[PDB]
Amino acid sequence: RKLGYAILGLGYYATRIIMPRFAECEHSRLAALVSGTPEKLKTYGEQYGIPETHRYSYETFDRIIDNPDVDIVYVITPNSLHRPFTERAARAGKHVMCEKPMANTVADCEAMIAACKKAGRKLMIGYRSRFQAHNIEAIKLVRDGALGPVRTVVTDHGFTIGDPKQWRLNRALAGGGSLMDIGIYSLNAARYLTGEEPVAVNAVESTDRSDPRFGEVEDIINFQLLFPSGATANCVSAYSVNCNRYRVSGPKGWVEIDPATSYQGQAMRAQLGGPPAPREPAPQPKNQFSAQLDHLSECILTGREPIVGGDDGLKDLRVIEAIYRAAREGRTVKL
Amino acid sequence: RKLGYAILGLGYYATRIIMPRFAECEHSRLAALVSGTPEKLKTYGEQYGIPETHRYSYETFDRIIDNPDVDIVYVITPNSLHRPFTERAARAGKHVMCEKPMANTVADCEAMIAACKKAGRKLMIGYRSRFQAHNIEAIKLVRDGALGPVRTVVTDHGFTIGDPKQWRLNRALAGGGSLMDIGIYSLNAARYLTGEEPVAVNAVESTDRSDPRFGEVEDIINFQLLFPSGATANCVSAYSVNCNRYRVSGPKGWVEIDPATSYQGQAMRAQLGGPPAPREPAPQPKNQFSAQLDHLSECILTGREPIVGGDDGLKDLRVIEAIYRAAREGRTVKL
Numbered sequence: 001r002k003l004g005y006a007i008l009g010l011g012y013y014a015t016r017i018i019m020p021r022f023a024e025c026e027h028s029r030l031a032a033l034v035s036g037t038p039e040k041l042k043t044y045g046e047q048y049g050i051p052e053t054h055r056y057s058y059e060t061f062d063r064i065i066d067n068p069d070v071d072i073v074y075v076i077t078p079n080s081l082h083r084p085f086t087e088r089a090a091r092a093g094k095h096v097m098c099e100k101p102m103a104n105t106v107a108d109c110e111a112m113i114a115a116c117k118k119a120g121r122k123l124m125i126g127y128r129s130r131f132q133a134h135n136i137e138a139i140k141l142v143r144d145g146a147l148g149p150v151r152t153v154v155t156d157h158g159f160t161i162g163d164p165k166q167w168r169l170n171r172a173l174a175g176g177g178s179l180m181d182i183g184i185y186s187l188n189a190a191r192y193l194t195g196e197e198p199v200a201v202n203a204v205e206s207t208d209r210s211d212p213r214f215g216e217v218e219d220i221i222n223f224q225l226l227f228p229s230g231a232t233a234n235c236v237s238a239y240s241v242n243c244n245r246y247r248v249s250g251p252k253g254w255v256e257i258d259p260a261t262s263y264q265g266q267a268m269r270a271q272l273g274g275p276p277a278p279r280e281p282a283p284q285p286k287n288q289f290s291a292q293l294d295h296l297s298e299c300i301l302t303g304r305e306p307i308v309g310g311d312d313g314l315k316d317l318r319v320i321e322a323i324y325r326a327a328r329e330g331r332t333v334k335l
Numbered sequence: 336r337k338l339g340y341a342i343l344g345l346g347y348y349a350t351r352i353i354m355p356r357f358a359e360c361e362h363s364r365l366a367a368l369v370s371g372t373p374e375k376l377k378t379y380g381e382q383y384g385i386p387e388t389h390r391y392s393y394e395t396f397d398r399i400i401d402n403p404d405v406d407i408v409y410v411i412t413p414n415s416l417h418r419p420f421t422e423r424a425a426r427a428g429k430h431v432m433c434e435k436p437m438a439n440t441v442a443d444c445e446a447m448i449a450a451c452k453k454a455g456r457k458l459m460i461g462y463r464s465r466f467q468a469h470n471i472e473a474i475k476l477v478r479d480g481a482l483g484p485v486r487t488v489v490t491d492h493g494f495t496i497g498d499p500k501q502w503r504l505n506r507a508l509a510g511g512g513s514l515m516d517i518g519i520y521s522l523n524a525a526r527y528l529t530g531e532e533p534v535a536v537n538a539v540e541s542t543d544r545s546d547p548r549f550g551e552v553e554d555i556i557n558f559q560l561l562f563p564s565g566a567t568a569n570c571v572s573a574y575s576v577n578c579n580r581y582r583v584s585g586p587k588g589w590v591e592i593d594p595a596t597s598y599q600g601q602a603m604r605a606q607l608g609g610p611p612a613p614r615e616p617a618p619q620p621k622n623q624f625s626a627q628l629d630h631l632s633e634c635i636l637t638g639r640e641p642i643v644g645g646d647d648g649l650k651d652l653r654v655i656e657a658i659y660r661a662a663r664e665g666r667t668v669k670l
């Protein structure tokens with residue numbers, strides 16, 4: 001049994017990363033396309049053998065309610081458009097996969113969660129790293145007690161962003177700067193590595209406003225998290241340096257991945273008992289993208305809850321709001 | 336020619352690490368021993384061929400003023416005793432090498448500086464990493480513009496401390512916890528890699544007071560620094576995990592060392608326009624310990640000021656005070 005996906009927003013992540021990976025899916029198939037660009041419907045429709053009956057514009061999208069080949073809508077638009085397409089998908093009676101960050105604000109996440117709940121449909125956020133072999137290995141090491149209690153997480157995510165005119169540097173479409181786009185991986189990892197939610201937040205923001213990229217959104221915003229167990233996190237989010245990594249440490253040792261949350265190329269190093277050494281993780285049957293896709297399908301087929309549901313996206317937005325507030329007010333913000 | 340060192344406080348660092356390294360010095364020699372333990376004066380006096388006339392207790396130390404073979408007193412005691420022994424050394428007409436952290440407080444550092452200035456004698460703090468090959472290479476890459484402007488420094492220093500009865504876990508003798516002893520390397524590195532002084536500080540402290548080690552001083556205190564240029568640092572200081580590293584990053588690339596400030600075994604990786612790769616630093620004429628010792632001797636001989644003088648130690652203590660305050664008050668502290 002395979003559930004049918006409609007892919008909505010045929011941009012870089014949809015066409016270059018996600019759509020090719022239906023190949024290794026065992027419980028998901030590409031069923032429909034939704035796009036604001038008629039040429040893309042034709043190009044990708046022909047490539048993937050999607051009939052015109054299964055190609056929608058953003059104006060005809062609501063008609064997808066009458067397409068029984070579509071079980072799931074995967075929303076892969078700019079951040080500010082996640083909420084309205086998710087709500088429309090839910091009203092069309094479809095389950096929803098929504099890319100990160102979930103939405104601009106906590107309230108927008110709550111609205112999305114309520115719409116899917118009202119429709120009796122499942123909602124999952126695209127945190128692919130939870131299906132990635134090295135990340136799973138680090139989480140399991142922590143959970144198995146290999147490190148002892150988690151004491152620190154140090155994690156940095158950033159890339160040197162380019163074209164000033166792209167939607168990620170436009171507040172109306174992006175909802176914020178590096179933190180919304182790439183810093184969220186630092187936050188999400190801090191949460192899944194500790195298995196906790198933070199109770200206190202510090203942040204420092206640093207942005208050169210004379211740079212043509214950064215008239216509207218932030219470049220650097222680094223933050224600290226305190227958790228109820230006493231665990232701490234130091235996190236970098238940046239649009240002007242390249243980094244992608246984390247190290248989680250306890251009294252018995254530590255494990256790091258660098259790059260940690262990239263599309264490929266992960267490398268893990270651990271210091272457990274002896275000197276630091278590379279560690280190979282248990283391989284996963286499917287790559288992280290196909291695994292993510294199949295996870296939602298499998299949840300729907302067996303009536304289970306996604307491990308990264310709407311609530312996970314919302315928990316991230318709650319901390320993101322506090323991070324921005326902490327930097328603005330120059331104080332420790334309590335959650 | 337060579338200047339004579341008196342080594343004061345014959346503990347682990349003095350006897351296991353520093354005193355063997357006079358072998359490779361070119362302008363420094365071991366001339367005297369000062370100790371509160373008669374047996375050690377005998378042991379090390381015999382081992383190193385130091386005559387009984389050049390052996391002092393803490394009671395007779397002031398008599399060293401009459402010993403012309405002694406040019407420099409190297410103070411290697413618990414932190415709270417740095418100030419009184421430094422002042423006595425200066426009043427005994429000797430130049431002073433003082434171990435880190437310089438002293439417990441800003442006021443104590445200022446007092447040591449005034450004492451040496453009054454005596455017309457030089458004061459240097461034992462920041463050996465400034466003479467270590469990998470660290471010098473990292474500073475050079477920054478100053479040569481290899482990375483572009485520094486945007487982030489991410490640095491972690493900690494070790495799993497043992498015996499609860501040792502002076503480092505005793506506030507009266509240590510002056511504070513992990514930040515005083517090991518976290519200061521994170522701070523000092525942030526400062527010499529940016530080449531700036533911070534203008535704002537955040538901090539988070541986390542200590543299990545039911546742990547036998549931590550009745551008096553702090554375990555983890557992580558901090559954030561903002562610099563005038565816009566550069567940022569995220570720093571870990573810990574007594575319950577092992578870490579020793581830093582990475583400095585700009586828009587053109589990054590360089591990291593791990594272990595960074597250890598006695599030996601430094602390894603460097605850099606990302607400069609290509610994928611991350613190991614990098615070997617330019618070699619140094621001698622090891623960081625002998626280089627540190629000769630640096631002070633050479634400064635005295637040529638009249639120059641040490642690159643890590645008393646003001647460097649003071650600058651660290653100023654930020655350390657702000658780190659503890661930021662943690663205590665839960666706010667961004669301005670400097």
Ligand SMILES: NC(=O)C1=CN([C@@H]2O[C@H](COP(=O)(O)OP(=O)(O)OC[C@H]3O[C@@H](n4cnc5c(N)ncnc54)[C@H](OP(=O)(O)O)[C@@H]3O)[C@@H](O)[C@H]2O)C=CC1
Pocket residue numbers: 008009010011012013014034035036037040076077078079081099100101126128167173181
């Ligand atoms: N999990 C991951 O690893 C990744 C997640 N993402 C997430 O995916 C989403 C899209 O990112 P990416 O695919 O990189 O962005 P792109 O700009 O490459 O694609 C965005 C697409 O969204 C559609 N769209 C609808 N309205 C607009 C609008 N007003 N302005 C621009 N585009 C619009 C367009 O598709 P059409 O022409 O079909 O309308 C456009 O091509 C974001 O939420 C991002 O965070 C991105 C990359 C990786």
Ligand SMILES: NC(=O)C1=CN([C@@H]2O[C@H](COP(=O)(O)OP(=O)(O)OC[C@H]3O[C@@H](n4cnc5c(N)ncnc54)[C@H](OP(=O)(O)O)[C@@H]3O)[C@@H](O)[C@H]2O)C=CC1
Pocket residue numbers: 343344345346347348349369370371372375411412413414416434435436461463502508516
């Ligand atoms: N730069 C570096 O890499 C390092 C720097 N250090 C610094 O060196 C100093 C000493 O550290 P370490 O050598 O590890 O500590 P140790 O405890 O091993 O040596 C301390 C010595 O100081 C003397 N001393 C004087 N008064 C006291 C006292 N009241 N209680 C205890 N000892 C006393 C004793 O020597 P005696 O018996 O001769 O009186 C004792 O052996 C500290 O400031 C530390 O921060 C330490 C390690 C490495």
Ligand SMILES: OC[C@H]1O[C@H](O[C@H]2[C@H](O)[C@@H](O)[C@@H](O[C@H]3[C@H](O)[C@@H](O)[C@H](O)O[C@@H]3CO)O[C@@H]2CO)[C@H](O)[C@@H](O)[C@@H]1O
Pocket residue numbers: 100158159181182242243244259261262263264265
């Ligand atoms: O070392 C990890 C990788 O670093 C580089 O990847 C960059 C991308 O070039 C850049 O587009 C950006 O992609 C992220 C995207 O903006 C975000 O929406 C999404 O959720 O995550 C994407 C992937 O992280 O940032 C990454 C930095 O990780 C480099 O191009 C790549 O080869 C390296 O593997």
Ligand SMILES: OC[C@H]1O[C@H](O[C@H]2[C@H](O)[C@@H](O)[C@@H](O[C@H]3[C@H](O)[C@@H](O)[C@H](O)O[C@@H]3CO)O[C@@H]2CO)[C@H](O)[C@@H](O)[C@@H]1O
Pocket residue numbers: 435493494516517577578579594596597598599600
């Ligand atoms: O990976 C780096 C090293 O980690 C371990 O070294 C520990 C020491 O065992 C511990 O004593 C402590 O030494 C520091 C000391 O407390 C402080 O006063 C001084 O200024 O710095 C000393 C050296 O850093 O912390 C270090 C951690 O750096 C490990 O034992 C060693 O093999 C590793 O090389």
